[PDB]
Amino acid sequence: APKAVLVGLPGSGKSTIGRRLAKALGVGLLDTDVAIEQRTGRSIADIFATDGEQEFRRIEEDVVRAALADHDGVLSLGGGAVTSPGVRAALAGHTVVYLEISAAEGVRRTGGNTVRPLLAGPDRAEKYRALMAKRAPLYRRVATMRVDTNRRNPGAVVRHILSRLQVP
Numbered sequence: 001a002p003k004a005v006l007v008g009l010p011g012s013g014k015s016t017i018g019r020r021l022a023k024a025l026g027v028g029l030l031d032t033d034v035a036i037e038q039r040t041g042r043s044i045a046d047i048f049a050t051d052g053e054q055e056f057r058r059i060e061e062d063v064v065r066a067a068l069a070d071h072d073g074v075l076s077l078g079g080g081a082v083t084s085p086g087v088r089a090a091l092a093g094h095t096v097v098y099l100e101i102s103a104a105e106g107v108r109r110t111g112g113n114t115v116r117p118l119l120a121g122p123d124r125a126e127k128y129r130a131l132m133a134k135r136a137p138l139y140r141r142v143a144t145m146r147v148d149t150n151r152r153n154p155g156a157v158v159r160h161i162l163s164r165l166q167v168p
């Protein structure tokens, strides 16, 4: 059982924070997007382009359920992880930290050049607003703790988290 599951829109910090939240607790971090690229031997960019999100979402669903019982440290979920009705029920009972972010910073932190299937230019922001709107509800449903990583220092966020994870 993960010491904490991290969910949030791509660009919310899931990785930056998943590392500091894991290194501070003394437990390895784990990414579902990365776990899938291993169990399949295929890049998520391909699995999407060739087989499709439909099938991908299934594979992710199976991989997540797999980590919710195997991993003992910090677990990080892919953006649309919470769109899978099955994934949301596997999260029931876990410590789920929803890292919130506004369309402003979210898009500013994702304008790099990593191949994001669901977030590709042009109008890469309209796409972000949509993802945010459509999913925001979902993240609330599975989140046992809502932390804002918007205006904050990657470390000051982990600071905030650990306190609320030790206090009732």
Ligand SMILES: Nc1ncnc2c1ncn2[C@@H]1O[C@H](COP(=O)(O)OP(=O)(O)CP(=O)(O)O)[C@@H](O)[C@H]1O
Pocket: 008, 009, 010, 011, 012, 013, 014, 015, 016, 017, 033, 078, 079, 109, 110, 149, 150, 151, 152, 153, 154, 155, 157
């Ligand atoms: N709490 C925070 N405050 C300030 N900037 C932060 C932040 N957390 C992360 N960032 C910045 O946001 C950028 C993207 O962060 P991150 O890589 O964690 O996205 P992500 O893991 O949510 C996306 P994906 O789901 O695609 O893997 C980095 O440049 C990072 O420095």
Ligand SMILES: O=C(O)C1=C[C@@H](O)[C@@H](O)[C@H](O)C1
Pocket: 010, 033, 044, 078, 079, 080, 081, 115, 116, 117, 118, 131
């Ligand atoms: O927003 C999403 O649903 C995604 C986020 C990434 O982590 C990858 O899992 C993939 O690009 C899909």
